[PDB]
Structure formats: C-alpha cells, structure tokens
Design a protein around this ligand. Structure first.
Ligand SMILES: Nc1ncnc2c1ncn2[C@@H]1O[C@H](COP(=O)(O)OP(=O)(O)O)[C@@H](O)[C@H]1O
Ligand SMILES: Nc1ncnc2c1ncn2[C@@H]1O[C@H](COP(=O)(O)OP(=O)(O)O)[C@@H](O)[C@H]1O
Ligand SMILES: [Mg+2]
Ligand SMILES: [Mg+2]
Lengths: 22, 445, 445, 72
C-alpha cells in the first residue's frame, strides 16, 4: 500500500541516494 | 585619472599555464573569452591560440610565436622575446582557473562602468530623447550585462547525480499527492491530471483559429487561478480594453448571460450575483489588468517585475496576444522579432519563476486541410516559440466549422508539446451563454 | 562643464503662476513635488506654500511673504524682492501644468544621471564586493528610479480601479435610454440589435464584390449618422468626386430616382424635395467630404485630427475604399501595406474614440464557389484586416448573380465577425431606384 | 548683388504670432511647411513648434526655449 510504497522509497533513498538526495 | 580594474598578472598567468600545459585549455575556454582581455596583444594571442587549438596544432611557445610571425602579427603582440618572457615568468604550479575567473569578473565590471558612462553621457546630451526612453535604455543596458553573465548555468551534468535527482523527484511527486497537481492549479480536473497544474518557470502557449474561445479560455484559467490561490495574477491585454475583460469576467463568474450584461437587461437576481462577485473580487484583491496597446517585451517584463517585487510573488502571467507585440530594433523581419519576443518571454519566465501563458494565432493555411485540428507545423513563422515553449495547447471547436456537429458546446484542448508529461486531447464543455469553460461530464475517450 | 539638467525659468514660471492664481495649485501639486526642484529656495518656497494650502490659507504674495517672515526664513528664499520678481515675470497666460510636467522630466533625467555616476563609482571601488554584488547594486539603483515612476495612465491598474471603471461604464450605458444602442445609430433596427451601434474605438470593415452596394451602404450609414447626431461626420472618398457623392446623397435622402437626377429630368415636386433636403443639410451643417485620391494613413489621421480639433469632435469616419490607399514605403509588398493600413486605422479609431467604417474588396475566386456569400477566408491577401477589425460585415445581393431570384430588392448584411456579440444575417430592402437601403418589412424567421 | 529672394520680417512675424496666439497654428500649417523657411534657425524653431503642437503641448516662449535647450 502507500505505507509500503513510502518504505521502499526510503529504502531506495538510503541504498542509492547520497549527498544531495532530497 | 580613473583606473579600470585590470589584472595583467592573471592574464599572463593564464597564458603561461596554457603554454606550459595544453591539457587545461578547456578549463580556460569555459571561463574567459577573447574580448575579456584588456590589452590588444593579449586578445590577439588568445585568438591565435584558439585557432591553433581548434586546428589540433600544439600551443607551445615556438609554434605560437612562429604562427604570429608568419601572419605578420608578431610585431603588434610584442615579439618572440616578449612571448618567451611570458612563458618563462609564469611558474608551472599555478591554478589557471582562478586567474581566468578573475579576468572574467573584470570584464563584467568594465562593461558595467562603460554602461554607466554611456547613461550619464546620454543624460547630459538628450538629443531629443524622452525620460522614458532613457529609463528603458538603462534597464536594457543593465539587463544585457546580467544576461551576459547568466550563461554559465547551462552545461553538462553528471549521469549519476541526474539519475538520483530524478528518482528523488519521482518519489516526492508520489509522496505529496495534492490530488495530481504539482504546479499552479488550472481549475479543471482533467487538465490538472494531464498537466499536474501549471508549472512555474515554464512558458505556456495557447493557439487557435479566430473565434475559438482563446481569450475566453485564457480568462477562465486566470479566474480559476485567482480563486484557487493567493498570489497576484497579472493580465496583459493588447487587444481589448480592461472594461470588456471585466464584463466578460462578470458574465463568467456570475453565470449571467453576456448579452444581458452588455445591453443592461438585468433583473434583481443578476444584480445580486454581480454584487456578490464584486464583493469576492474586492475581498481577494489579487488581479491586475493592463490594457495598453503596442506593448513591448521590456514594458511587460518591467511591470511583471514590479508586481512581483510589490507583492512577493506572481501566481500567473497572461499575455493576449503575442502577435501584437513589437520589437522596434527588428521591425524589418517578423521572424527575428518573434524570436526576440520568445527569448525575452522565456527569460522573464525563468527570472520570476512564474507560469507565463502567451496567446498566439494560426495562419489560414490550417483551414486548407480536410481535418482542421491544429498541429505543431501550424506554428509557421514562430519556430522559436515552438522550441522555447514548455507547454503548447491548441483550442479546437468542431461546432465552429460544422453546424450539425454532435459536439455542440464541446471544446478540445490539444497538447501539441508538453515538456514534463504526455500529450493528448482534453474535452470540455463550452457555455458561450455565460462565456465560460467547464469540466466535461460526458463520456471520455 | 557637465551642468546637471535644470531649467530655472520653468521653476520661476511655476512659482509665479501659483502666486498669481491659487486655484491652479492642485494641477501643480499633482505634477511636481518639493524634491523635484533644483535650487534650495524653490524647494523651500514650495514647502511653505504646501503648508499654507494645508492650513487653509491663501497662497498669494502677501500671505506667503507674511508666513515666511514670521518664521524668519524670508532671507533664505531670496526676499520679498525675489518673491515680487516671481510675481511680476509670470504672466496670467500660464499653462502651469506644462511647466510642472517639464520640471518633473528634468528631475527624472538628473536622478538617472546621478544614479549612473554612483554605479560607475561603485564599480571603480569594489571595496571587497563581488561582481554579483555590484550588478545587484546597479539593478537596485535603476529599479528605484523606475519603481512605479508616474505612469499610472499606461500601467496595470488595480482590480478595484478596473472594476470601478467597468461599473461606471455600465451605469453610463444604463443611464440614457436608447433601446439597446450604445454607439452611433445605424438607422436599422435589426442591425442595431445585432451590433449595439457602431462602437467607439472599433475598426469596422464592410466588404462585398463589385456592384453590390458598398459605397451606397456607406453613404446611407453616413446620412443616418448625420441625421441622428450632432457631431461632424467625415468622409474620405478615394473613389468618387464629392459632387457625385452629393448627387447620390440627394437621391438617397429625397427618394428621387437616380436616373432623373443624373439626366436633369426632374419636376416641381422633386425640386421642392431637393430644396427641403438642402435646407435641412444647411441647418444641420455636420457633413464633411474629402474626395482626394491616393491618401496615406498619415494624411487621413492628420485630417481627421484637424477636423476634430476645429469642430469639437467627430461622430463617424468613412473610407471608400482601402484598396485605393497608399503606403509609399511598402508599395513592394501588398500584404505588408494592408497590415500597416489596418494597424493605422485601428490606432486612429482608438485615438479619436470614433467609429471608423472602411470599405474593402474581395478576391475574384469567390465568384467560382457554388455559394457566393462571402466568408472570412474570402479576404485573401488581407489576413491582417480580419485579424485587426473589430466588426466585419459583408453585403450580399442575390439578384446580382441570379436573374430569377425571389429576393429582388432584398440585400443581406452578414456579420462575419462580431467581437462583442452574436453573428448572423440581417435582411434589408434595396431600392436602387432611389439608391437607398431601408428596413425590411417582410416576414422574419 | 544676386540676392536670394527672402523676407525675414514675415518669418519673424509668423513666429511671434504663433508664440502669442497658439490657436493660429492651423492657419499657418496649411500655408507653409518647415522647409519653406529661408534661415536655419527659423526652420529649426518651426520644426520644434510642430513637434510641440502635435504632442499636445503649449507653444509659449518659455516652454519652447526650454524644449530647444533640452535637445541642445
Ligand atoms: N443609375 C442606377 N440605377 C439603379 N441602380 C444603380 C444605378 N447605379 C448604380 N446602381 C446600383 O448600385 C450598386 C452598387 O453601385 P456602386 O456603389 O456605385 O458600386 P460599389 O458597390 O462597387 O461601390 C449596383 O449593384 C447597382 O445595381
Ligand atoms: N455575445 C456573445 N454570444 C455568444 N457567443 C459569443 C459572444 N461574444 C463572443 N462569443 C464567442 O466567443 C468566442 C471567442 O471570441 P474572441 O475571444 O473574440 O475570439 P478569440 O477567442 O479568437 O480571441 C467566439 O467564438 C464567439 O462565438
Ligand atoms: Mg481577441
Ligand atoms: Mg464604389
């Protein structure tokens, strides 16, 4: 659902997103 | 004796670094230009080095001096002895980028001083110019320098950083719902879904054949933006006086027949509705209208800047229509005039970070086809507009051409070019009785 | 020497005219401020006069001198001698507003020069400021000069001002009953209903194929406007000499057969009717005719301005026909010439606030279509005319093409483009015997 | 001498009358053009007066002299 989608969003942000990110 | 700020040491260091290191030329190439050098010999040296670098030839001392000698330009520069002194004096361990940046900054300062002197000289000896012309001249002079230094923001970007930013943007859009609207709300559900609102800093073009409701659609968008926001909304109307615009707006908002308003045949309820509309407008007070004729891009930009300064932000800017705008310097060719107008509009959109909706018109050639629905190529003579436009919407009405059409009261907004979304056709209801567009309640295809 | 822009005589004129006439103060106060004056004494004088005006006292010579003397500042101003000099040199034939505007202009130019000098001085002395800071400073300085300035007439007004103007216009329209006619009365009920009269500041085009009655309809409109108004009506007849126009006008007004007038075979009753018509015309005296040929838009504008200046305004302007006008600088390209003509006519109509009716011609290809009733696309080679015109009417007579027509004597005025209302066809009766159009008395669908 | 036919008195009278009576410009504008004046100063004055008259401004002495001064 929305909660799982946001959790995966945060997981991908931690995995690849760095420096700038959001 | 005034001393213009010149850094001869920085230029000599740049030249020496280029002679002793040919790999750094690109770093110098993106920071300084030939005209940025004060002394003529330095400009000539830089031009010769640029020619050699573009031809693939080495830029060492012997080849550069020899090339200048061959063309007879060595004597003007200062000689092989001067070139050798420049090469030897500069130490190898130097940061050419810092010196190049200093030289770049000095050229901007010198241009600013030159513009100030020109303005003062023009003021002392008007030669028949008006004060308004001098003010416009000064604004143009300063903005030229600003744009001259506003070209470094465009360049290549890192692939990984772009990908990460794209992923973050996708997540944020899916994070903050806003029911599918990210930009300025258009007031229409389907248009919001297909556009995610009106995106700030994006140029929007509305084009259609005559009598298609283009001004009506633009006014409906303006009214919706005003009712659904708080920032001021500015209107530039080069074709209508403001009173007719307000009458059309009253007809649209109060849902009263426009002919009745125009002829004055209004009953008590219509007067009450008009009073309510006026009360709402006076409570909000965020709409500004300018019905000047023969507008120039400088006046439009200045008035937009003044509104944004006075109120700290603009919800939306509307221009109707750009075919009536003029550029006096390019009156000889219409295509150049259109390109200048489009460039100035794009610069204003970037500067104020506001959505700009400019209305345009189509040639009669569109009506020479069996299907009269507009396409991109129908933007002939305005190629720059099509390229610089971030959103392009065409208005079509089948009932205009066909009396027996089944889509009476139905208008199509066709997205011919969308920068950040899909293209397609959106059907809406057209109540010409109230001079309004509404969401289409029928079946969608 | 670079003496700053100033005019001591204009200031002296302003102060003296205020001393001699105190009812002009407002006009001076709305145009000049105490800081606009260059010399300190003039600023002090204006400040003291403003204080006296605020307290409710007259600002004549003795009152001003006494008020200055009580504060001990009479010597700083220059003395009662200087005040008397101001009183003496200024005549009572003073246009104080013009001098105040001029003083305003000098101050603006002077401030621009001062700001340019400040910008240059800042550029030559960075004091550790980045070039970005210097450009921002320059922008701020020029912006404060230009910030709102005094161009409230040619700037975007507030929503309140526009709404108030619209409501005042609505009240003015609803004040005087004319049964739905706001512009110049066309003399025909259905055309008045469809067009609400000929609106001021509008461009109106009448088009038809040859021998349809363009000149006849234009002259009928001129006659109706002259009979139903009081302002002069001006005609620009580039096609016919004025004598033939007056013969046609007599035939129309007196309802006498055109052939009889042309051949001179009239009787006593016709002579009596002509005498009555001449008496009516000489009692009215508001029709002016210019039968020159090859007129440029500049000449038309100049002559219309001269007529309005001499006789207190115009009620209608008529041009027959625009194909006979000339723009020498653009004779190479017909499309550009037509665009310039239409733009100049629209500008003239907006400037003089009068309806302008211009006759035009259509391409031959219209005669090849199955249905010969004109459409907008029939204005080929003249797209700018369709773009710029506020109202477009086509004259169609069926009997011209069909000998067996059932509509003999019946003409149709087709509104091809109505900017502020509906479109359709209006039927009239054509009496070619008297060279006249009349209201259609037949059944209406 | 081979004198160039001209009359300064008529030009000076016209300019003075225009300065004193601004309502007569038309009666002068339909009988003479700027290029019809013989001396350069008179042509220049007439051109400036035409500019002021067609810009909507009075043509009195102080305004005309000041306007000429502003253009140098
Ligand atoms: N002597 C006449 N008797 C009757 N009708 C005439 C006469 N002269 C002209 N007409 C009518 O006037 C119409 C238009 O003529 P005119 O206005 O002169 O040309 P245009 O319409 O091109 O300006 C023609 O259709 C013709 O029928
Ligand atoms: N009084 C009216 N009654 C019905 N429809 C009107 C009225 N006034 C204007 N319209 C409609 O508004 C539409 C748009 O007109 P306009 O804004 O003048 O042209 P554009 O949209 O090309 O600028 C036209 O198609 C016309 O049918
Ligand atoms: Mg329009
Ligand atoms: Mg004719």
């Amino acid at each position: 659902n929305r909660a799982q989608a946001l959790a995966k969003i945060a997981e991908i942000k931690a995995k690849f997103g760095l420096k700038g990110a959001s | 004796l005034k001393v213009p700020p010149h850094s001869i040491e920085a230029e000599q260091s740049v030249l020496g670094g280029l002679m002793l290191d040919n790999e750094r030329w690109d770093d110098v190439a993106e920071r300084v230009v030939a005209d940025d050098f004060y002394t003529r010999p330095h400009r000539h040296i830089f031009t010769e080095m640029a020619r050699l670098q573009e031809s693939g030839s080495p830029i060492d001392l012997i080849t550069l001096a020899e090339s200048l000698e061959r063309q007879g330009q060595l004597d003007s520069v200062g000689g092989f002895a001067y070139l050798a002194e420049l090469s030897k004096n500069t130490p190898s361990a130097a940061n050419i980028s810092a010196y190049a940046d200093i030289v770049r900054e000095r050229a901007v300062v010198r241009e600013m001083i030159s513009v100030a002197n020109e303005i003062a000289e023009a003021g002392f000896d008007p030669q028949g110019r008006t004060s308004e012309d001098l003010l416009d001249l000064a604004e143009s002079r300063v903005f030229k320098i600003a744009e001259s230094r506003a070209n470094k923001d465009e360049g290549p970007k890192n692939i990984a950083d772009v990908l990460d930013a794209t992923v973050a943007r996708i997540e944020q859009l899916f994070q903050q719902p806003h029911d599918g609207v990210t930009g300025v709300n258009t007031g229409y559900d389907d248009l919001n879904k297909k556009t995610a609102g009106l995106q700030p800093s994006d140029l929007i073009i509305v084009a259609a054949r005559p009598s298609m409701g283009k001004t009506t659609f633009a006014m409906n968008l303006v009214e919706n933006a005003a009712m659904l926001q708080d920032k001021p909304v500015l209107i530039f109307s080069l074709e209508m006086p403001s009173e007719q615009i307000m009458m059309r707006s009253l007809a649209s908002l109060s849902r009263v027949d426009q002919t009745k308003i125009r002829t004055g045949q209004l009953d008590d309820e219509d007067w009450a509705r008009i009073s309510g509309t006026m009360g709402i407008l006076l409570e909000k007070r965020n709409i500004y209208i300018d019905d000047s004729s023969g507008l120039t891009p400088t006046e439009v930009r200045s008035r937009a800047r003044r509104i944004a300064r006075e109120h700290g932000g603009i919800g939306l800017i509307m221009i109707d229509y750009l075919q009536l705008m003029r550029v006096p310097a390019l009156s000889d060719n219409r295509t150049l005039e259109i390109a200048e107008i489009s460039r100035s509009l794009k610069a204003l959109a970037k500067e104020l970070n506001v959505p700009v909706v400019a209305l345009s018109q189509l040639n009669r050639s569109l009506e020479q086809r069996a299907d009269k629905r507009p396409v991109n190529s129908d933007l002939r003579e305005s190629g720059s507009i099509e390229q610089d436009a971030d959103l392009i919407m065409f208005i079509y009405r089948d009932e205009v051409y066909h009396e027996n059409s089944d889509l009476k009261g139905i208008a199509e907004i066709i997205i011919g070019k969308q920068r950040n979304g899909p293209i397609g056709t959106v059907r809406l209801t057209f109540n010409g009785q109230w001079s309004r567009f509404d969401n289409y309640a029928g079946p969608q295809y």
